[PDB]
Design a protein around this motif. Structure first.
Motif, short mmCIF file in Angstrom:
data_model
loop_
_atom_site.label_atom_id
_atom_site.label_comp_id
_atom_site.label_asym_id
_atom_site.label_seq_id
_atom_site.Cartn_x
_atom_site.Cartn_y
_atom_site.Cartn_z
N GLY A 1 0.81 -1.21 0.00
CA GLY A 1 0.00 0.00 0.00
C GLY A 1 0.84 1.26 0.00
N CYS A 2 1.90 1.28 -0.80
CA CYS A 2 2.85 2.38 -0.81
C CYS A 2 2.89 3.00 -2.20
N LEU A 3 2.65 4.31 -2.27
CA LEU A 3 2.78 5.00 -3.55
C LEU A 3 4.22 4.95 -4.05
N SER A 4 5.19 5.17 -3.16
CA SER A 4 6.60 5.21 -3.54
C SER A 4 7.40 4.57 -2.41
N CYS A 5 7.86 3.35 -2.63
CA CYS A 5 8.61 2.61 -1.63
C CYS A 5 10.07 2.54 -2.04
N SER A 6 10.96 2.94 -1.13
CA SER A 6 12.39 2.83 -1.33
C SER A 6 12.95 1.81 -0.36
N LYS A 7 13.98 1.09 -0.79
CA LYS A 7 14.51 0.01 0.03
C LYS A 7 15.09 0.53 1.34
N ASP A 8 15.83 1.63 1.29
CA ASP A 8 16.50 2.12 2.49
C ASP A 8 15.53 2.80 3.44
N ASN A 9 14.60 3.59 2.92
CA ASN A 9 13.70 4.37 3.75
C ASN A 9 12.31 3.77 3.86
N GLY A 10 12.12 2.55 3.38
CA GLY A 10 10.79 1.97 3.44
C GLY A 10 9.81 2.79 2.63
N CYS A 11 8.57 2.82 3.09
CA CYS A 11 7.56 3.62 2.42
C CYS A 11 7.80 5.10 2.68
N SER A 12 7.38 5.93 1.73
CA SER A 12 7.54 7.37 1.84
C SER A 12 6.30 8.16 1.47
N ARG A 13 5.27 7.52 0.94
CA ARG A 13 4.01 8.20 0.65
C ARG A 13 2.92 7.13 0.64
N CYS A 14 2.14 7.07 1.71
CA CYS A 14 1.09 6.07 1.76
C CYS A 14 0.01 6.38 0.73
N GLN A 15 -0.93 5.45 0.60
CA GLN A 15 -2.04 5.65 -0.32
C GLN A 15 -2.92 6.81 0.16
N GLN A 16 -3.99 7.06 -0.59
CA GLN A 16 -4.86 8.19 -0.26
C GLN A 16 -5.53 8.00 1.10
N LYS A 17 -6.18 6.86 1.30
CA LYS A 17 -6.85 6.56 2.57
C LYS A 17 -6.03 5.58 3.40
N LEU A 18 -4.86 6.02 3.85
CA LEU A 18 -4.01 5.15 4.66
C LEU A 18 -3.14 6.00 5.56
N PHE A 19 -2.70 5.40 6.66
CA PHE A 19 -1.94 6.10 7.69
C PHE A 19 -0.45 5.86 7.52
N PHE A 20 0.31 6.94 7.48
CA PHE A 20 1.76 6.90 7.35
C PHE A 20 2.37 6.89 8.74
N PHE A 21 3.05 5.81 9.09
CA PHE A 21 3.57 5.63 10.43
C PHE A 21 5.05 5.30 10.38
N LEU A 22 5.81 5.89 11.30
CA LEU A 22 7.25 5.73 11.36
C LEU A 22 7.60 4.74 12.45
N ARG A 23 8.36 3.71 12.08
CA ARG A 23 8.71 2.63 12.99
C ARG A 23 10.19 2.71 13.34
N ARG A 24 10.49 2.65 14.63
CA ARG A 24 11.86 2.73 15.11
C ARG A 24 12.35 1.34 15.49
N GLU A 25 13.49 0.94 14.94
CA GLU A 25 14.10 -0.34 15.27
C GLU A 25 15.61 -0.21 15.15
N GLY A 26 16.31 -0.32 16.28
CA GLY A 26 17.74 -0.06 16.27
C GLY A 26 17.97 1.36 15.81
N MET A 27 18.86 1.54 14.83
CA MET A 27 18.93 2.83 14.16
C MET A 27 17.97 2.93 12.99
N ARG A 28 17.52 1.80 12.47
CA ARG A 28 16.70 1.82 11.27
C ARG A 28 15.34 2.42 11.57
N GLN A 29 14.95 3.40 10.76
CA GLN A 29 13.65 4.04 10.86
C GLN A 29 13.07 4.13 9.46
N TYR A 30 11.83 3.70 9.30
CA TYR A 30 11.26 3.58 7.97
C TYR A 30 9.75 3.70 8.04
#
Lengths: 236, 117, 190, 104, 190
Positions: D3-32
């Protein structure tokens, strides 16, 4: 003050988690450690051991740290099998040659040391199978040609004392190298930290500093030659 | 030890060359006269002076490490030695060529020998 | 070779931002450690808290700029470790830099700077006097502080003018010798 | 990358769909980034016309909140009263353990 | 002006000692941040995770070398903040240094280095290309890492002995001018 230890004086201790022996000069054989298969660490210094049993890596499967310094070790047996082994230190021994398969499959090896030995011939593919090796030490030896394959992960290295090592090394194989100490500073001209430094006494690529200085000495030489030859012509 | 010895002979030489030039100056007969010998006398005088005019600083920079009181970068002694050690030599023939009529006579002789060659 | 130390006192605003107040210090990069720049939180350690060979009781996180206060040398007639040994032990424990307060044991300066063919990859700095007492006063009063070790680059190369003016007297004197002989020549002319 | 308009490998999703929630997940240093149909526990879905993002439940003692300050259910040991967490049911109210919330 | 970055990993031995394995990197100190040396653990941050004005959800400790990966400039046609704004916000959160991966948004280089009369006390470094992909590969793989940023001191002053040769030509040419006139004078003598 341990002088002598019985040959079979440590077997069957199926949970002996460590073993350190120092100063046991009268010992002349490796201890008969069969059965003791849980030695995380091992040390044997200042003893007259000549060789090593070959099934060492097949017995102490989970061996982690090993040290055999200050001994008369001459021939290195195959080390394949100690897949958890990390540090090996064999300095101050009579080791004279290194074969290709001695370090075959030492995945977890981190620290290595062979300094103050008689090694002169290293097989080209000695370090091909190595893992994340960080410190390698072959200082004070008779090396003439130094293989570099499978060594890009190194962080620290020493070659001081290898007088026969009159050659240099390609930076393409030392991508992550940080500290180096070569016998001749010119070996460091190819490259971060170095010892001894390539000072202005011993430059890297230009013997006369910068341009326009080479021109200075050029002009000096031409005028000296021409005027001197004309002076000889006139005088004699 | 070798540097100290070479300096010792250098200072003794400079002293005795200065003394000899002073003796030449004290000679009124050769001084006031316009003899041709005085041409090369002065010539070797300027040569002998410029020898340490250009080498004395090299000695200073060679003893600079011995004094070990000033932090001297390697480049400074490198440059001064590479430029001032060959310097006292490369200019002497120029000075004799262009500051001595005796050389002009020798050059006339050379031209005569070349033409008759 | 001098070390520039700044101690930063950050205070957590409830909104999430950080407010910092810093204090200056100056030490000397000792020969035992490479003259580099480090940064980490201050963790003061007792002198006798390093010889012990059971670190499992005090497993610290990496990058802690340890601080030690050396005491009267006669007060420890049986020294557990040399000062370099203390520095090595601290670096083993995950320290990123080590700072010694040698205000009471001045001989430690030459002990550190003496011939030791085993330099440490992390800087070692010794302070003394007003800076030392200031550091001790802040350490034993605050709660959390982050120290920064700064190595100022070298100064201007005054070597520029040195040799051209040197050559200036050389050329002037050489010409002076030449004209003095010319003056004698003019005297002969008269 | 669902459900990602534009997904990048390093940064995960970067623009969710129209009716969807964009949430940032913290794990170690990785945030996506991520796209979810409903923000997880401890967050309240804040809608927007450009991108809909989750935000932390600022009300204390809360595990699920409908808005920035209204908690649908508090943690243990705190009865629910008008979306607010109280260890005790105040005057005019009595504890009720069966649903773990303050009743009249 | 170039920035040298070391990425250090840890393996906490049970005894308490720390083992490290470092990897090299090279960036460029951007004009927006003062060229200094900083050290701290890597905390990667999403580009969109900075403009938010509620930090209380994720209050971090002081001294963390943040890392950002900028994306396609058209992917964010309504830019939440300028890059300098992102750096300022990160420093507000307690970051001790900021590193940008501009491999996909090269214009960010000139955006950072352009005229900005508000430089930041902490260094800002942008990387691109092989170093950038290496950093991204390690960041999204390891568990804990500490980044060290080093400002290399300037190189040798060749300015030293360039005047010596410059004045050498000047003196030689002036001598050439004088000696050519002397040659004409000798021609008159003949």
């Amino acid at each position: 003050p341990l002088s002598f230890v019985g040959n079979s004086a440590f077997h069957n201790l199926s949970d002996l988690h460590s073993l350190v022996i120092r100063g046991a000069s009268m010992v002349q054989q490796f201890p008969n450690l069969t059965g003791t298969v849980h030695l995380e660490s091992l040390t044997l210094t200042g003893t007259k051991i000549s060789s090593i049993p070959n099934n060492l890596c097949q017995e102490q499967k989970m061996l982690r740290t090993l040290d055999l310094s200050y001994n008369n070790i001459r021939d290195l047996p195959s080390f394949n099998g100690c897949h958890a082994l990390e540090e090996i230190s064999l300095q101050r021994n009579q080791i004279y040659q290194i074969k290709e398969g001695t370090f075959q499959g030492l995945i977890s090896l981190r620290i290595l040391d062979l300094s103050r030995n008689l090694i002169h011939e290293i097989h080209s593919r000695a370090f091909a199978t190595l893992g994340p090796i960080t410190n390698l030490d072959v200082s004070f030896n008779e090396l003439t040609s130094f293989p570099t394959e499978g060594l890009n992960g190194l962080n620290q290295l020493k070659l001081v004392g290898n007088f026969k090592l009159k050659e240099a090394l390609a930076a393409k194989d030392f991508v992550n190298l940080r500290s180096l100490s070569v016998p001749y500073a010119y070996q460091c001209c190819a490259f971060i930290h170095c010892t001894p430094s390539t000072g202005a006494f011993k430059p890297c690529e230009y013997l006369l500093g910068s341009w326009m200085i080479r021109l200075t000495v050029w002009f000096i030489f031409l005028v000296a030659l021409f005027f001197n030859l004309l002076v000889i012509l006139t005088t004699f | 030890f070798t540097v100290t010895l070479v300096l010792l002979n250098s200072l003794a030489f400079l002293l005795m060359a200065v003394i000899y030039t002073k003796l030449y100056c004290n000679l009124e007969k050769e001084d006031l006269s316009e003899n041709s010998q005085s041409s090369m006398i002065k010539h070797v005088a300027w040569l002998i002076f410029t020898n340490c005019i250009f080498f004395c600083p090299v000695a200073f920079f060679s003893f600079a490490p011995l004094i070990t009181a000033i932090s001297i970068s390697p480049e400074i002694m490198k440059s001064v030695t590479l430029i001032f050690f060959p310097l006292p030599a490369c200019l002497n023939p120029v000075l004799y060529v262009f500051f001595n009529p005796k050389f002009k006579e020798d050059w006339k002789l050379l031209k005569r020998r070349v033409t008759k060659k | 070779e001098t070390a520039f130390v700044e101690v930063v006192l950050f205070e957590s605003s409830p909104s999430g931002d950080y407010t910092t107040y810093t204090t200056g210090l100056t030490g000397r990069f000792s020969r035992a450690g490479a003259t580099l720049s480090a940064e980490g939180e201050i963790v003061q350690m007792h002198p006798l808290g390093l010889c012990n060979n059971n670190d499992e009781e005090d497993l610290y996180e990496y990058g802690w700029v340890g601080v030690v206060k050396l005491e009267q040398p006669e007060l420890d007639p049986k020294p557990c470790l040399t000062v370099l040994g203390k520095a090595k032990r601290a670096v083993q424990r995950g320290a990123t830099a080590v700072i010694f307060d040698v205000s009471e044991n001045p001989e430690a300066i030459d002990q550190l700077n003496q011939g030791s063919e085993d330099p440490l990859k992390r800087p070692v700095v010794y302070v003394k006097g007003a800076d030392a007492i200031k550091l001790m006063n802040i350490v034993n009063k605050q709660k959390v502080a982050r120290a920064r070790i700064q190595h100022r680059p070298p100064r201007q190369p005054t070597e520029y003018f040195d040799m051209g003016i040197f050559l200036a007297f050389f050329v002037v004197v050489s010409l002076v010798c030449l004209i003095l002989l010319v003056k004698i020549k003019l005297k002969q002319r008269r | 990358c669902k459900g990602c308009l534009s997904c990048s490998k390093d940064n995960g999703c970067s623009r969710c769909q129209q009716k969807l929630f964009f949430f940032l997940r913290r794990e170690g240093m990785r945030q996506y980034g991520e796209c979810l149909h409903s923000c997880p526990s401890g967050y309240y879905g804040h809608r927007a016309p450009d991108m809909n993002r989750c935000a932390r439940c600022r009300i204390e003692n809360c595990d699920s909140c409908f808005s920035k300050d209204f908690c649908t259910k508090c943690k243990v040991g705190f009865y629910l009263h008008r979306g607010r967490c109280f260890d005790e049911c105040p005057d005019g109210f009595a504890p009720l353990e069966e649903t773990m919330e303050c009743v009249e």
